[PDB]
From a paper:
Glycoside hydrolase family 18 (GH18) chitinases (EC 3.2.1.14) catalyse the degradation of chitin, a homopolymer of β-(1,4)-linked N-acetylglucosamine, which play important roles in various life processes. For instance, the well-studied bacterium Serratia marcescens produces several GH18 chitinases to efficiently degrade chitin for nutrition. Because of the extensive roles of GH18 chitinases, inhibitors targeting these enzymes have potential applications as therapeutic agents and agrochemicals. In this study, we used SmChiB, a model GH18 chitinase from the bacterium S. marcescens, to improve inhibitory activity of berberine.
In this study, we found berberine was also a competitive inhibitor against SmChiB, a well-studied GH18 chitinase, with a Ki value of 11.79 μΜ. The crystal structure of the SmChiB-berberine complex was obtained by soaking and was resolved to a resolution of 1.94 Å. The crystal complex structure clearly revealed the location of berberine in the active pocket of SmChiB. Berberine occupied the active pocket across the sugar-binding subsites +1 and +2 which was characterised by the aromatic Trp97 and Trp220, respectively. The conjugate tetracycle plane of berberine was sandwiched by Trp97 and Trp220 to form π-π stacking interactions within distance of 4.2 and 4.3 Å respectively. This observation was consistent with our previous work that berberine inhibited GH18 chitinases mainly via π-π stacking interactions between the tetracycle plane and the aromatic residues in the binding pockets. Moreover, an unoccupied hydrophobic cavity formed by residues Phe190, Phe191, Leu216, Phe239, and Leu265 was identified. This space provides a favourable opportunity for the optimisation of berberine at its 9-O-position or 10-O-position. The binding modes of 4a-4c against SmChiB were nearly identical to that of berberine. As a result, the berberine analogues were able to form additional interactions such as hydrogen bonds and stacking interactions with surrounding residues of SmChiB, which may account for their increased inhibitory activities.
Author numbering:
A (entry chain A), B (entry chain B): 3 to 498
Amino acid sequence: TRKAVIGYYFIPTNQINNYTETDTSVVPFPVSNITPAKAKQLTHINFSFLDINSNLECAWDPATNDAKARDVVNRLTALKAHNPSLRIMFSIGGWYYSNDLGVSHANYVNAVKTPASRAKFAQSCVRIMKDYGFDGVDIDWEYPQAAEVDGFIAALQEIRTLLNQQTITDGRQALPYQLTIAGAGGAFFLSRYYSKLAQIVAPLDYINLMTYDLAGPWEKVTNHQAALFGDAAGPTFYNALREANLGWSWEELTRAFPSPFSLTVDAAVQQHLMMEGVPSAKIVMGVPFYGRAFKGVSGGNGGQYSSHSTPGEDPYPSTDYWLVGCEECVRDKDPRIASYRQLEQMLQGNYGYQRLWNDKTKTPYLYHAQNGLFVTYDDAESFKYKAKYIKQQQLGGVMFWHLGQDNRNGDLLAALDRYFNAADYDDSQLDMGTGLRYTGVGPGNLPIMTAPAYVPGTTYAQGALVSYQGYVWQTKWGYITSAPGSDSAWLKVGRV
Amino acid sequence: TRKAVIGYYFIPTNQINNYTETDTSVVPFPVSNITPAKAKQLTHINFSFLDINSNLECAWDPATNDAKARDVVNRLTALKAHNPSLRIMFSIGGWYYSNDLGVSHANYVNAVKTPASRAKFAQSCVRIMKDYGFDGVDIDWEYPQAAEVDGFIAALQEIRTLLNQQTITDGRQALPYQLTIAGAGGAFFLSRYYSKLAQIVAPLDYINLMTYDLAGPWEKVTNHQAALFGDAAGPTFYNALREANLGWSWEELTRAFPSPFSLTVDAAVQQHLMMEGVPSAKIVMGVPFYGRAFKGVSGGNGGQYSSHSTPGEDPYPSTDYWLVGCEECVRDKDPRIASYRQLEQMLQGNYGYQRLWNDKTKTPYLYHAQNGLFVTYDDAESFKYKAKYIKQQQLGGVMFWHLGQDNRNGDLLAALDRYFNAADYDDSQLDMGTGLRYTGVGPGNLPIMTAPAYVPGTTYAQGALVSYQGYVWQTKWGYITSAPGSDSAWLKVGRV
Ligand SMILES: COc1ccc2cc3[n+](cc2c1OC)CCc1cc2c(cc1-3)OCO2
Ligand SMILES: COc1ccc2cc3[n+](cc2c1OC)CCc1cc2c(cc1-3)OCO2
């Protein structure tokens, strides 16, 4: 089965309203830059972003010129001429619209609140899909809180029901309409809904993990934003999942959620696989096509794990564009983010950057020793290890933000496609290194074990193992006369 | 309010059937030893034990001569002529009948299963009470398991309903019929039903905690069986309450249930009071009128906290009675337990026993250096500290197992009554020592706290405190945009 390759196409309202394929000052990345070769390397394009309005319906931003929007979307769906498996999804939400303090947050909360509201919202999603010609629905609410999760789930179930009906009505068995979400890739936000992951992922084709932005100027210590594995020399974090609303025991929580821990891509993936009912095949690893830049860093680690002086707030609360060589940063008025395209040009421009490699995290970084700058980013090399991980862990594929940030040759997308599909690419000896793996164990990833069947009537000592109702259990203390499941003395430690 | 003084009167069936007040070889402790003075020192006698039979009704051991039982019970209820507050309860259960592997356990489990069975059982209880002249019902099931708790609770509620009706029907408003249970005094057994303590204690006048047998030959290290407070030099135990099905977060469990911990009387009491809806006035502290003995102990600490050679199985798997001086050990054919009466006699008989005192646990012990014997017990000195604790913690009173183990003058019973009621006893300056206190915090003992009201739309840093919906909450990490209770990010730390 082919791995998914899901690329975001983000276009702001003002670029739609002034869309041209002839002026990168106005539209830096028009649809024309998605060549047939690139269209064939994608399985999905997530057009972004739509929103939920005051009427609790899916909708375009009210300032959108609808004729221009339709034309942009038609250009994207025309790419299917080059790739009969390609789907143009649309994404609802994103940080700006749907974060707790964002402009439309209340509409997300209220849309999912009732049977009537969920039905109206779900219908509106399918209507948008059909009217503009999209191939599925992606929801990027960042992020539902605990009390909202059940309504969120029910809304997803309702969309699934309509989409399946629409597939049959439209003859689309060969390319069914799909439903995805963008999920948190770090434990703090994930702990909002982690306990209900199984019910969240049941109606979905994929959950696309945002396994990036794991570092940024809002943290006091510079770090890799998408480390695959952990580096003991780097910062560690409170494991927020041990506070999730799971109902588990102290021993269960402790063995599943070591704390502090390394905030890495492997952590997020393994934390999802620890839950029963979450299939590896639905998990999609997100990767960034951009880096995050920091100023005021010190030496001794190439800029890693240093204090810094980078403002954390949004929008960038300054006019000082200190990322030397970053013309896109001046255009966009933020030196703290740079596309891979721009970073490549900064590297070939002799601006004083060194490209370094951390072989524990398996990620590159830039250090500017003259000016004290650090940039965490991904490239075709880090993507080798991530793609091997996706294959070994039997994940559904890869997602990235976003297409406009690749270089003009499409090298990052071409790399991902190569690592999954090229017949002359062989990563059998790629060394995944000795960086820290996430070691938590939970009900969904218990080791297979054997043990004598439990016998009613028997008194068991501390540490005894038995099999019962399909699991292997271990006593936590002595003189146990109760059966596994029926008494808190037993810990589930294996699968039969 | 007068403190309860609840003494168990245990008599085996063979002693009931051959009852006599003229031959200690046959009945060691006849009721006639309960003089009018001793009668005024008690508030309750728990006659022990009745059972639940295969008809799922309260009943006497079927081997009981009924007339002889009636006569013993009359000897007890005649004592009420000397104390108009005295109640002669009867206790159903005990370890032998009701432990998981005991002879009647299935009858306890099945009696409480359905509305019909609970009604039949409860009416059984009230009928026995009235037929024999008892003043209330005590249930000593050691111990209901989690799936049985709800049924057990309903049975208690049913008994409560009937007893109240009987109160009004017999005009007993001045001395209403009562309902009590014996509860676990150590965390391992307590963990079976701890999460439902509120429901359990609601229908009761008292829950009588079995805060003894906290050490024994089944343990690998010698220790005090009823330490009031902890000794850091002593052994510590896994806190099983952290595995009870409470539904609390990792931080909540950890702050409520330190582990390892000192298995003490104070621990059991404070563990009960950490649960909301468990009033201190219903909690009764149990104390033992017997000691437990260990052989093969090393020197250097008076035999405390040493290895040993004592068998742990029941019945005693030997005829070697190695406890120099203990008559009763041969009579009853177990050298591991000895009444306070017998231990006093061993102390005055110049057998080589030294009485030592632990001023952290506030308890006595006996050491026998030449044959290496260790005895843990209580006496009138340890009872001073336990009685002051009962007063300071506003507990309901004291319970003890059992009357027939006090010395012939009843010094232990007299001591308890004195410490609670004697005008010429003054414990105002009694020093409770520096032993370890149990410091866990839970929903039932959250402190009053004060903090600024939560402000929606505000972002909070790690450690911030707000007031919201009746509690004070603290954030566990930073950049918190969610409301308290609404999120894994916030920890209940106090009450408004
Ligand atoms: C640590 O928590 C934070 C704090 C701040 C965060 C800010 C942003 N994101 C996650 C954040 C986050 O998630 C982990 C997602 C990507 C993004 C794009 C943006 C933007 C802000 C953000 O401004 C406009 O474009
Ligand atoms: C270590 O686990 C055990 C193992 C064995 C145990 C045996 C007994 N108890 C706890 C035990 C225990 O609890 C900790 C409670 C008191 C008791 C009275 C008895 C009796 C046995 C027991 O026989 C009749 O009279």
